[PDB]
Design a protein around this ligand. Sequence first.
Ligand code: ZN
Ligand code: ZN
Ligand code: ZN
Ligand code: ZN
Ligand code: ZN
Ligand code: ZN
Ligand code: ZN
Ligand code: ZN
Lengths: 455, 91, 93, 76, 86
Amino acid sequence: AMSICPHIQQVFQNEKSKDGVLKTCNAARYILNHSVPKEKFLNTMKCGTCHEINSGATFMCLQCGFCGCWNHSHFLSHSKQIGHIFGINSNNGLLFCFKCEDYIGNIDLINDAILAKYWDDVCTKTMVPSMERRDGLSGLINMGSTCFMSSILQCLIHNPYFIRHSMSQIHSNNCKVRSPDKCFSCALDKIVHELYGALNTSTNRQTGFIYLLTCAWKINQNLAGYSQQDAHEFWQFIINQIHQSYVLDLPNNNKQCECIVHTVFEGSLESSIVCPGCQNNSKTTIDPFLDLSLDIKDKKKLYECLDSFHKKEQLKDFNYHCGECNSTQDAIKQLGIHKLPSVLVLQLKRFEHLLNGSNRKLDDFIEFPTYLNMKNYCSTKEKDKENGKVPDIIYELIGIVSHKGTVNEGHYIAFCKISGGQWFKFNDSMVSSISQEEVLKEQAYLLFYTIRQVN
Amino acid sequence: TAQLKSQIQQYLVESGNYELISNELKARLLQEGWVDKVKDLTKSEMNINESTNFTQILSTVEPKALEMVSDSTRETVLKQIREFLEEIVDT
Amino acid sequence: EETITIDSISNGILNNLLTTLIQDIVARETTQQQLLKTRYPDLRSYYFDPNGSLDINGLQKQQESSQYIHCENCGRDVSANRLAAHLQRCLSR
Amino acid sequence: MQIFVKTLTGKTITLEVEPSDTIENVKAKIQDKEGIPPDQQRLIFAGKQLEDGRTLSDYNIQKESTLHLVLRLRGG
Amino acid sequence: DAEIKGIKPKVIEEYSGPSNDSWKSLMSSAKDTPLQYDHMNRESLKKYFNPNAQLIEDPLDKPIQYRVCEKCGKPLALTAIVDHLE
Ligand SMILES: [Zn+2]
Ligand SMILES: [Zn+2]
Ligand SMILES: [Zn+2]
Ligand SMILES: [Zn+2]
Ligand SMILES: [Zn+2]
Ligand SMILES: [Zn+2]
Ligand SMILES: [Zn+2]
Ligand SMILES: [Zn+2]
């Protein structure tokens, strides 16, 4: 029967004391989110007693300006000596009670303290997530050949950027069509409603998916679920539909699109054309991308496939005249990344074309990492004490789509990672727990990576 | 005196090098899977001890998490700290 | 009065960085679990099957083609595994 | 103008095209070089598959842009 | 490996008991400072990412934060609850 800190409960029996606490919590957290790194170190991570930086957690006092460390028990002494039992951890904004010797993590008002002014209304209008729906885990039944659709939809539904978009009511608020049987984004929001909440009021939780199938049939019957199709083609199809619904909902020389697709998934390639003699130049072309398609033959690791993507090539069928040496040359071409996306989507080219006009699937295992560093693929280097260096730019793997079968027939499954590190396998109606060690052995076709650390 | 440690740390922060060290350490530990191992270790200790009390859970997690740091990460990061230290101390 | 060296001070800097990070990670874990346990007194883990057969509720794959869907467009019950085929013949006109 | 196609192996080839050339025409040129029929080709630029009946200019494909060629992996 | 004696005088020249400072001294600057991330460096984001990029730091740190509407059952981001109508 989990308890609550009685020391903060006592304080909260007085309304102005409660408001004072929340106001200070909001201020400390605001400071932590709006302070440059050196300032944050020097003014929130410096112990007032020993003056060390990062002597374990540093706590910002709730009642005064003092900061105190954990490792040398220096906040603990401030609490005993001044009687201030509450401090905020400057790494995470969490509130510690030094009497309980525990954080206060289970008071909803404190956790969502930015809404303190409206809390009464928040509780009357809303409830916490139901246990069974909290992670949005639910299967999408096979409605014919719908694995290429459902595998993609599970990756969308477990994508934190799409999640946040849908739950923030951005589409709902501005949609000019408002029918889930016509509007793809409405159908998607309905799926999110069904999986995380409850539609008013066994085949369970398929309503949104059926709407989606209905939208798809009207726009492109080949991709609507009757026949076997390519998950990558369906992925590109759905993100284009989200973009198209944004443009429709606009009330109105502005080149970058501001929709959820184009602010999440879009990066740019830099393609350079360089003289093999002068090696100086170059004629650079910038091409947008929403994903990268990688070759895999004769390779065993994802980094090898990215290395191949980024490798210089000498072109033999390109007409090229160098201006620095004034002569015809076979130009050197290279692709690198000009701009990275928040979510990087990778397609492994698991197919080859044979001389008899048939195609064949490439089933070879390609090792892919839990965290992907893209620094070696970025075209432009920063200064470093000589050519320069790109800093670590690390993504977290959150989704995989795999195919079992041959080029013309098979089955798709999705694997998604949620908070805490648990992976789930989405095989049409069946949602199951799977270990990371086993997920990492899958034959990956599509990989979804979210930005995690940028140095 | 022990003002030295705090002094040295202040210089590291003002110089920009504390950030480089802190950021590179975090990146290394993240990529080698240590961050997630420590989360798993923490969940396990909470289950074994039937407790979410931070002080008691930390007492078992922290020592172990420190041992879990790869030799590679420890010596690479130490090497980097020592280079930045050899910049601004006389020995 | 123990001797201070680049090696010793460096070890102390690394220890400061590592214990802070550990403490951050642990605080995030314990607060989250405290919330989940308070929020959901009867909280149960998602089922894990070493055999790879049972879902997160400990259930087997339901028998399709045993399930049906009521088509909102025409009012007929349709076998769930044939809904896409049905919609091709039902949504047109 | 010249544009590029990064083929199935990753080898890049060059096409001579007009901004007004249709996707069908482009796929025919790729077939001449790579031997893949047009109905088997998926040509990707800027996150979209290029559709028959449209032109290169419809997709803002310019001089020295690179198109990405893939096939289809069907599943149910 | 050898014994340290002091801190170089030139470092002190331009760098350098209970403290008197206050964490609340940061509010003035913080009010004027754009949103910062702990481990997504601002200058590197300008160089390597789009200027309009959406960014969620550590998106899997904790489970999805939301509440459910009592009237219609919609899952709502905490920043969307006040304005939400039927
Ligand atoms: Zn307490
Ligand atoms: Zn201290
Ligand atoms: Zn105090
Ligand atoms: Zn809509
Ligand atoms: Zn867009
Ligand atoms: Zn030349
Ligand atoms: Zn019907
Ligand atoms: Zn509502």
